[PDB]
C-alpha cells in the first residue's frame, strides 16, 4: 500500500565524485513508537542484496562512511560522498513501518570511467558442434567502456540481420568495464555454403571499426 | 551468518513446489524470517513472513491461499510450500532474516530460481571455444565454452573447479526463439601458457541433472 518512489532510476557518476539518490514514500514512515523504519540496500552485479543502512541513517556492519542516509517523514536520501568502482550495482530503499513491506524500484549506479577499447576475438565452431547439424560463430568483445558498441556480422561480405544474438555483462565491480558476446548461428549446410565470416566492431575507443574474420578450413 | 536456499526448478502451471532454506551462524529460533522474490531483470517483492514466536505468518496479496511458509527450528530450516503456481510466480526466491535488534531485514541468501512454464526441461550441449590460429599480437589469447540450448535457467560455470577466477567472464543467458537458453563463458589467457596449463570448464545445469567438465584445446 505504501508506495516507495526512487529517483533517478539510472545514475551515471564519475569516480571520486558524489552521488545522491532520492526515496520518497506515499505517506510518513514515522512509526507510532517514534522510530522511522527506512532502509537501504545494494545489489552488486551477480550478488545477493546487502543492507547498507537502517533507521534512516544508521550504517550496517562494515559499510564505509562515504555512505550516508538522511531524511524524515516521507522524503529520504542516500548519499555517497565519493563514488568508487566497487559501488556499482542497484540500490533499493524499503520501508518497515507499514504492513505490507514495500521496496523502491531500484536505482542503477553506473561508473563513468575512461574510454577503453574492446579486445576483439572471433571463434570458430567446435568440431563437436560441427558434427551435429548446426554451427555457432562467436565474436567476443572484452573489457570495454562505454557500453555502447555496434557489432555487425558479414557473410561473404553480406550484412546479416535477424540471425544473431548478443549478451552483455553488467559493469565490472573492479575495473568498471563491460564485455559482450555476439553469436551467429548457422546450419551445417549454410556455414558450408560460404567462406568469409566477419564480425565488424564499432566503438568510441577505436579510430575506425575493427574487423576480425576467418575463412573456414583454416580456422 | 549463512542462509542457503534450495528446491527451485521448473514446474507446470498449476503445479506445486517446496523451497527450503538452511540457516547457520546464528540462533535461528530467535529470528523472524521471510521470503522475498525477484523476477529476472526486475525488482524485489515480499512474499511471506513467519515470526520467531507461535508460528504466526503473513502473506502478500498475490500468494494468499497458495503459498505456506513454515519453519523447523530443530533443523534450522525455513520452508515455502508453493501450490497452484502461476507463470507470474517465476522468480528468484530469497530467504531473508529479520533483525529485531536493528528493526530491519538484514541478511539475504543466494536465492533459488523457480520457473513456472509448460516448456520441457532440456540439458545443454557444452562446446569448447577454441583459441584462434594463430594469431595474436600481445601474447594473450581468449578461450571459453559455449553452453547451448538448455531450459530452464540457471546454468553455472566455473574454471579448473574454482581455482581459476581471474580473467573469467560468464555472459548472461540469451533466450533463443526456440525458447531455449544459450550462454558462453570465456577466459583470457597468455598465449604463453598453452600446452602447459590445463583449462577445464565446469558446467552445472541442475534442472536437467547435467554436470559436465570440459577441457579446452586449440584445433
Amino acid at each position: 500500500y505504501v508506495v516507495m518512489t526512487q529517483s533517478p532510476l539510472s545514475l551515471p557518476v564519475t569516480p571520486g565524485e558524489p552521488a545522491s539518490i532520492s526515496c520518497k514514500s506515499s505517506q510518513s514512515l514515522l512509526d507510532s513508537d517514534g522510530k522511522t523504519y527506512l532502509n537501504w540496500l545494494l545489489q552488486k552485479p551477480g550478488q545477493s542484496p546487502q543492507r547498507l543502512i537502517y533507521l534512516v541513517s544508521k550504517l550496517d556492519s562494515g559499510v564505509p562512511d562515504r555512505f550516508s542516509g538522511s531524511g524524515s517523514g516521507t522524503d529520504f536520501t542516500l548519499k555517497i560522498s565519493r563514488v568508487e568502482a566497487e559501488d556499482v550495482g542497484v540500490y533499493y530503499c524499503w520501508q518497515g513501518t507499514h504492513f505490507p513491506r514495500t521496496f523502491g524500484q531500484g536505482t542503477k549506479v553506473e561508473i563513468k570511467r575512461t574510454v577503453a577499447a574492446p579486445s576483439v576475438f572471433i571463434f570458430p565452431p567446435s568440431d563437436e558442434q560441427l558434427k551435429s547439424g548446426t554451427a555457432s560463430v562467436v565474436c567476443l568483445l572484452n573489457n570495454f567502456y562505454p557500453r555502447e558498441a555496434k557489432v555487425q556480422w558479414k557473410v561473404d561480405n553480406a550484412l546479416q540481420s535477424g540471425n544473431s544474438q548478443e549478451s552483455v555483462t553488467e559493469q565490472d565491480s573492479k575495473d568498471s568495464t563491460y564485455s559482450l558476446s555476439s553469436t551467429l548461428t548457422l546450419s551445417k549446410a549454410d556455414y558450408e555454403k560460404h567462406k568469409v565470416y566477419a564480425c565488424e566492431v564499432t566503438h568510441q575507443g577505436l579510430s575506425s571499426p575493427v574487423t576480425k574474420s576467418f575463412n573456414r578450413g583454416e580456422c | 551468518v549463512q542462509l542457503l536456499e534450495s528446491g527451485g526448478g521448473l514446474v507446470q502451471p498449476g503445479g506445486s513446489l517446496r523451497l527450503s532454506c538452511a540457516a547457520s551462524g546464528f540462533t535461528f529460533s530467535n529470528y523472524g524470517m521471510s521470503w522475498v522474490r525477484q523476477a529476472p531483470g526486475k525488482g524485489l517483492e515480499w512474499v511471506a513472513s513467519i515470526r520467531s514466536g507461535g508460528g504466526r505468518t503473513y502473506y502478500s496479496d498475490n500468494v494468499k491461499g497458495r503459498f505456506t511458509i513454515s519453519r523447523d527450528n530443530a533443523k534450522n530450516s525455513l520452508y515455502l510450500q508453493m501450490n497452484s503456481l502461476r507463470a507470474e510466480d517465476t522468480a528468484l526466491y530469497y530467504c531473508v532474516r529479520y533483525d529485531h535488534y536493528s528493526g530491519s531485514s538484514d541478511y539475504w541468501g543466494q536465492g533459488t530460481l523457480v520457473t513456472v512454464s509448460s516448456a520441457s526441461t532440456k540439458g545443454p550441449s557444452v562446446f569448447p571455444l577454441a583459441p584462434s590460429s594463430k594469431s595474436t599480437s600481445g601474447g594473450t589469447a581468449a578461450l571459453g565454452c559455449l553452453v547451448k540450448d538448455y531450459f530452464p535457467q540457471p546454468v553455472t560455470v566455473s574454471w579448473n573447479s574454482g581455482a581459476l577466477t581471474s580473467g573469467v567472464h560468464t555472459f548472461p543467458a540469451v533466450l533463443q526463439s526456440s525458447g531455449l537458453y544459450s550462454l558462453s563463458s570465456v577466459v583470457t589467457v597468455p598465449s604463453s601458457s598453452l600446452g602447459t596449463q590445463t583449462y577445464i570448464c565446469n558446467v552445472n545445469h541442475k534442472p536437467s541433472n547435467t554436470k559436465v567438465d570440459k577441457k579446452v584445446e586449440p584445433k
Binding site: 524499503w94 504492513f99 | 523472524g32 528493526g103
Partner: peptide, 6 residues
C-alpha cells in the same frame, strides 16, 4: 518488516 513488530 512491520509484521515482526505489529
Amino acid at each position: 518488516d512491520a509484521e515482526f513488530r505489529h
